[model samples]
Target: ADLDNGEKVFSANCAACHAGGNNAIMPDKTLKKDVLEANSMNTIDAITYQVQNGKNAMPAFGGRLVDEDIEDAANYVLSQSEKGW
Candidate 1:
């Protein structure tokens, strides 16, 4: 899953807000398991699309990041969520 890149990407780009799966920008919009399910963002596809499109009051990373990086980040998020991150 290229987890090393995922961790690096997430740490560099996403850790500004999503430290430990918590969302600072939107308190309710966290990567927590329940939040992801309730918001329908539990899947890798959903998270990838959202992270790419930026429909949730955040900037899109599609242009800034390559597809593989985003995908790895998606997988990273899902896996972390699975681990109760």
Candidate 2:
């Protein structure tokens, strides 16, 4: 249930760009694949760090996401992109 909620958040906030790939706003025109792969493999700590801190052009979701949302969202995304789904 939590994961599903996270997915909703992702779609509403992240999918517009993430799902757009090369056409995404502020596209990662360089070393994109490597960055994405590394992010996908990041530890929970690392992932949460990003959710709390955010990256370039991405707004921090710490105050808004809540703890479980961060965990569930990161896990859900990683699972879909990696081997542990």
Candidate 3:
């Protein structure tokens, strides 16, 4: 899944609000393992969907990031989530 590139993409596109897997706008929605599991965001599909569609204060990255970038970012997030990020 090109996790290396995924980490880069996340830094450029998502780190502003999600640095250290923390959600700046949603205190209860951090990307940590337990939070992701509780919110059904532990899978690639769910994360990809949210990135592509955007919800609430989150902005859609469908057109902003290329398909591969999005996939990589999703993969990266999942990998980090698994590691308790």
Candidate 4:
């Protein structure tokens, strides 16, 4: 999975709610380092699960998006988090 594709996928599917990796509905549950760490979502596995299954107000994209696409998005989140977004 590449970051370019991930970015595209995230833009199309996630950016509406998680623009710039920040959760609009819930401010405290953003994809940023502090929020992810506080919520134990720093790992790809955890992030993947959340994406696939959905959490709180987040909708599940399991069937709507392929696993590879999901992985790409997860990787995108991790990469962005590393950059302190």
Q: Least lDDT summed over 10 consecutive residues: which range in candidate 4?
A: 26-35
Q: What is the C-alpha RMSD of each candidate to the true structure, in Å?
A: 1.2, 3.9, 1.1, 1.0
| Global lDDT scores for all candidate models | 0.88, 0.63, 0.91, 0.89
Query: Each candidate: how many clashes?
Result: 0, 0, 0, 0
User: Which candidate has the highest TM-score of all?
Assistant: 3
Q: Which candidate number maximizes lDDT?
A: 3
lDDT against true structure, model 3: 0.91
Q: Least accurate stretch of 10 residues (summed lDDT) in model 1?
A: 50-59
| Residue pairs clashing, model 4 | none
Tens-digit per-residue lDDT, 1-85, candidate 4: 4788899999999999888878899887888888888889999999989999997789998989999899999999999999986
lDDT of 2 by residue, 1-85 (tens): 9678867766775675565333265654311345557546356677677768887876788988778878877766655545422
lDDT of 3 by residue, 2-85 (tens): 899999999999999999999999888898998888988888899998999999899999988888999999999988888877
TM for candidate 2 is 0.68
By TM-score, the candidates rank as 3, 4, 1, 2
